[PDB]
Design the sequence.
């Protein structure tokens, strides 16, 4: 399908219960998702990322990211636009 | 003895499904390997053209997703399929 | 506060149904987990880790780690103090 766009050295991938795929776009300091059937990726409203290294999603839809370049972990609840720093 | 991963080079990621099958991105060897309960030899999954894969996920249907880091892309492979899809 | 502390170039993250978060603390050769409910981080008793690159946790609570610097994968069952090399 080839619809993710503009990735550089992507570092991790997670897939949630709805089949949405999440990718840490390491080389571009962002996290992108692609819903099942979608032809347009969405950049998640994480903020201040630096070379993110990995991602997980739990069964409640919360997305967790290791923000490698900032020595921290951040998370984003499903339907939230505002990250929590862990 | 067997039921061991062999030949791994700078492995980058791991995923496990509820059947207990372990999936590993063998970064240095441009390949993805898995090992199921009761299998004494690992399987190299038939992805194509990988370079330095960085991470892996597996969904409920057993489809394997890989960040093909060296090629700036994500690919997936359904269980038992030999033809990957680029995402 | 509810956060990981003392991380260095963290490489990967996993999460379980109870809300526990697990991180490969790559720069410090360790794996740490953070309690869902409190400000408690626990160092898992893996042995000889070297720049670990990734982590997974299964339904039984077994923690799996790609031990990047040692070209191996190791696991630790919930409640065990003894890792198994895969």
Sequence:
């Amino acid at each position: 399908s080839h619809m993710f766009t503009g990735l550089n050295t992507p570092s991790g991938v997670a897939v949630d219960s709805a089949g949405t795929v999440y990718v840490t776009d390491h080389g571009n300091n962002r996290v992108v998702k692609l819903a099942a059937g979608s032809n347009t990726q969405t950049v998640l409203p994480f903020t201040g990322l630096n070379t993110p290294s990995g991602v997980a999603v739990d069964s409640a839809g919360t997305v967790y990211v290791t923000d490698h370049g900032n020595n921290r972990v951040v998370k984003l609840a499903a339907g939230s636009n505002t990250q929590t720093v862990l």
Observations:
- The radius of gyration of chain B is 12 Å.
